[PDB]
Ligand binder design. Sequence first.
Ligand SMILES: [Mg+2]
Ligand SMILES: [Mg+2]
Ligand SMILES: [Mg+2]
Ligand SMILES: [Mg+2]
Ligand SMILES: [Mg+2]
Ligand SMILES: [Mg+2]
Lengths: 67, 107, 69, 63, 141, 206, 141, 80, 145
Amino acid sequence: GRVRTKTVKRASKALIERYYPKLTLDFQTNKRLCDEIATIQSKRLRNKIAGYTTHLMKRIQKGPVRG
Amino acid sequence: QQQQIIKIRITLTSTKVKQLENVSSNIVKNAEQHNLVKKGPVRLPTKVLKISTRKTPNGEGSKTWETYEMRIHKRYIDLEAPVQIVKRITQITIEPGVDVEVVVASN
Amino acid sequence: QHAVILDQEKYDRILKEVPTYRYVSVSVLVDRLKIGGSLARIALRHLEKEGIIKPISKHSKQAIYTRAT
Amino acid sequence: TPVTLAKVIKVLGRTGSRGGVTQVRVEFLEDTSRTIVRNVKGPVRENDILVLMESEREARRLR
Amino acid sequence: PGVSVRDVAAQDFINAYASFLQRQGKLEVPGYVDIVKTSSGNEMPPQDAEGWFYKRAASVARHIYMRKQVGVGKLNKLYGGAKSRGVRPYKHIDASGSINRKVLQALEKIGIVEISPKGGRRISENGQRDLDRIAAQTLEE
Amino acid sequence: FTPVVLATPIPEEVQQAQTEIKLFNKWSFEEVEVKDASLVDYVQVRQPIFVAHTAGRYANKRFRKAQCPIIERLTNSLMMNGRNNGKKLKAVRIIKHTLDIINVLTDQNPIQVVVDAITNTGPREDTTRVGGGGAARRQAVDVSPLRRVNQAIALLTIGAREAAFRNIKTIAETLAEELINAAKGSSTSYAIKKKDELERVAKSNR
Amino acid sequence: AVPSVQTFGKKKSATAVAHVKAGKGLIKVNGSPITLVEPEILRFKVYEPLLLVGLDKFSNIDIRVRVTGGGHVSQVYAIRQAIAKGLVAYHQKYVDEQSKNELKKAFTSYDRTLLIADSRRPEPKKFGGKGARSRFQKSYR
Amino acid sequence: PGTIVLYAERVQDRGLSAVAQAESMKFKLLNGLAIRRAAYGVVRYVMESGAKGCEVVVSGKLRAARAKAMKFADGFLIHS
Amino acid sequence: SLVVQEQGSFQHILRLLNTNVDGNIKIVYALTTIKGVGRRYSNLVCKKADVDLHKRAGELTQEELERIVQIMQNPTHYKIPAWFLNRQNDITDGKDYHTLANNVESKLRDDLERLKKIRAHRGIRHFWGLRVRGQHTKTTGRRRA
RNA sequence: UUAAUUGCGAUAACGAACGAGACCUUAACCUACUAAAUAGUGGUGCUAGCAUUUGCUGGUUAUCCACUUCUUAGAGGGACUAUCGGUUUCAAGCCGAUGGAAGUUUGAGGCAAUAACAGGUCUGUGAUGCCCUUAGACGUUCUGGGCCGCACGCGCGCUACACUGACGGAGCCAGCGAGUCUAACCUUGGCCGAGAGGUCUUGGUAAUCUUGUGAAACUCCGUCGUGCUGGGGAUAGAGCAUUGUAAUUAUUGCUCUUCAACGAGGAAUUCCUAGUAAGCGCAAGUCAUCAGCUUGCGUUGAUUACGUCCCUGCCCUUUGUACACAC
Ligand SMILES: [Mg+2]
Ligand SMILES: [Mg+2]
Ligand SMILES: [Mg+2]
Ligand SMILES: [Mg+2]
Ligand SMILES: [Mg+2]
Ligand SMILES: [Mg+2]
């Protein structure tokens, strides 16, 4: 039951594409930088975005990603 | 009437902690800038009022039980100053929803 | 069904048989003798102050007793 | 009667009408390379070890 | 070798001290004892006869020493239990007020419990003399 | 080894427990190896514990109760049937009495005896009512080693409960009667017969 | 001047504060010693912090303990917890970490609840049933 | 007397006042004006006052004995 | 507080006011077999007679038995504050009585007989076999009582 | 695959909205900020007690110092499944170890879409249309009864049938609430009485007083020993008090005593997956008193499975229809 809404996924995909040099493979820095490069109305929602983004980009280190 | 310490105690309760925090932080900072001897704010255990009631105006339906709440925060702030200096900043700018209770201590 | 008082034809059986019992309880005495519960209850109370068997555990409602030596 | 041991390898899936039964693929630690599937009731994991009375019977209730 | 009433189990502490009161023989029982059940939650009176008042006194005597000031109401609550109220469910029923008050009054005559102007009844200077002496007894045999 | 002088004088019987992590004060946790295969890794050994009563978070997952200690496992299965739901203090004292009684006889390791008993009385082959209806057939199924142990622990308890119900007997000795009967193997106890009934029905409808 | 620590230990409703500081090997819990905790079957349930690390690590410390809240066995879990953390926090600040560390690995390997509170918390009941998840017995007839 | 006083003032941005619209819906219908006509009138003004969305629900029998309830909506409405 | 052993100077079951007291049981709960006497009324009078509670009503003496029967018919003369008897403040004389075993029915029938005579709602309920204490009989106590 | 039309994917659809989620409240942590005599702690200005050579406790905060560890509430920090391993079309995800206060949507609720029901409510309303009644009233009030009447059938409940026990003495720990000057509310303590209870004083408009609601279950020791027995208190006669103007149809509480079925319950059937089921009581609602009821709160705390369509219900797709007021 960990399937995320499109709001988490779309924001995570949009964020990483235009900010890949800014992001880093660590979640603690990713959630910290997200507070200034995006406006999120809840820390729980912001963590879900940063939790998926640090999950998407480990797979970026493993070959390509479609989309 | 020349710097007569009176042991003045102010008690504040409300229902909106957002509005209550505005008033409490003002008297506290007012005494801080007037370098009083200040007993910092003490927040009482926020009392909660419960009324459970059946949703149905009739008796027909599944046994559903709603319950409403009121939240009663409470603070008491004690100040140490002459009567004249503190009465000018207490009679005015009282934000609504905060019933002010100023009392005098004789301890 | 079961005896209720103590007499010599029942007392000598108690003395001659209780040694070499590995385990003695209120019910075991009621099973292996004609004594009742309280008669069994004064059994484990009495014969230990004669020291014939050794106490390992002491608890109300439950006899935990072992033959001495 | 020669009771024999068996050791689970793959939990092939859950079966039975009510979901109780399981089909697991077991192996024999004595007289190895004999692999048979069995219809098992309780919870089970990988590398699990169990006991079988007989080896001359496959697991039937599949799919 | 300092021994207060803290270093003996409360089971054999009361048994010794009630037996200390047994040989003392001047506890001033009120005379209507050995017949009352001491609680509506109790359906038959206390089984012991010769020393149950000594049991009640000694158990209570610990309570004032443990606590600060205790009226009859606290001791009334403490020793009451659950009442079989019949075909209806159980409920805590307060115990008897006549005995435990007189138990306090009886122990007042000994010189153990004061009048405690800050509440109910409190310990005395002579209150813990026998207590700590019996406590000194109960640890070392 | 040598006595240590503390301002709180701790009794000698309890202070010696540090030299070997035993049970309460008397019984050990060594040589508890299981004579019967397929039940090792599914009965808790080599986790020394001081008590049969713990606040054990063991049901939140699928197999956390597999690591639940077996002397706690039997206490929890005992504390049931309406008038004994809850009250684990009743369960821990009953086994405290039962472990005393069981070592009164048969001087060997008490945990080894119940380990022998749980191996002996575990439903070895169970039936399954294949087909979704009353007019159906039973089919014999090899039982899981956990399910063998988990069910049979209740078979020790349900036998002693029947023995202790409306009888002169008490539950501690009847339990200590039920563990010694299962460990030996007699078909005299309740648990072995109920295990045997499941086997005899199973062989008929393989 | 005198070195001391003070740690807490909480359960479903119980709590316990213990002050670990230099002494001569004293344990005291509400006045009565650790040997006099209640009941007799749960006496030993608090000795594991002593038994795992040894009385040899208690030579030069005295322990004062208070416990409140919850129910009878819940305090015993709370008493054994704040005692365990009290020693660990004491040996951290004034002794080398390995003494604290050896305590930590020993306690965690046996029972993690000595240094960690049990996060299992009660679930409130819901209308339509006396339990948190249990429901009223409907009929359909 | 004198311990209670009144200051009457005017609500700004009237189109965002759900209560104030309700009587203007009530007053238009009490004259004889068409229920469809008034409900379209109120939502257009509310929407043009900067609102993200407005929903107007009239319920009750209308020109037929068997009562029917109909809605009138615009913009974005959320419910949870 | 001491424990004393016992010896079998026994006598078996005997009658007691036409109510055969059951033997082999403790005296207080043996006197519960006496009608109109409960666990309370047996415990107190046995303590009055100075008898040990652990006599088991089998190794007793006739001298103690003739003492307690006097306490049976005449209880107020053995230090009771008279709130402890079976029939408090009776109708016939205003005196507190303790009707003994055999005749509880006689004062029970006479009580209903008076209620039958007075033609009160209670007495009419008794003759009809209904519930007198206001208990509902619509769907409870249907076939019996 | 998910709890989810939740997502990945395939793809004549693409881009969206509502709903789900997100959100909010509440429980779980913080030796890091703010503090506190309406909370607690340690020392001690001032002292006090004993067993003693130092442990606990009466205490005092311009009749002392310091602080938030615990209690509290403001600001935050914290979890997003985190790292790794396994597996999947190597995607969405699921399993396990470890670390962590916490890894079942973190636990639970509040809200919750379109369309609908001839569902229920005219007995909440001075929300309301039509009909009826309107002076001998279906309007309003007073007295008494009835709603509780009792051959019977059915539903929700409490007490049990005993030793995993009852009884007696002892040990003896909670949390959520409520409480009167807009007057007789929560009540402490003293006195008297077996008890219920009576009387006098006392604190509290309430983190202060009831209150630490010293609840019960539970724990220690003794009485009972399988006997419808001391399990069971139904039923019934007496007396004693309280609330009420009134307790009779027993309002209820207390004491003696009377002492039934009930020996685990046919067909059939109810709810429930971890601080959960169950046991146990407590607080509030109603209320002058009456709970066997409900809503919450705490105490003790199981068994069993991480699955399926076998029954039951619902939903979807295909298909048939002479149904559409829709079997
Ligand atoms: Mg939505
Ligand atoms: Mg929710
Ligand atoms: Mg209809
Ligand atoms: Mg509380
Ligand atoms: Mg109701
Ligand atoms: Mg066709």
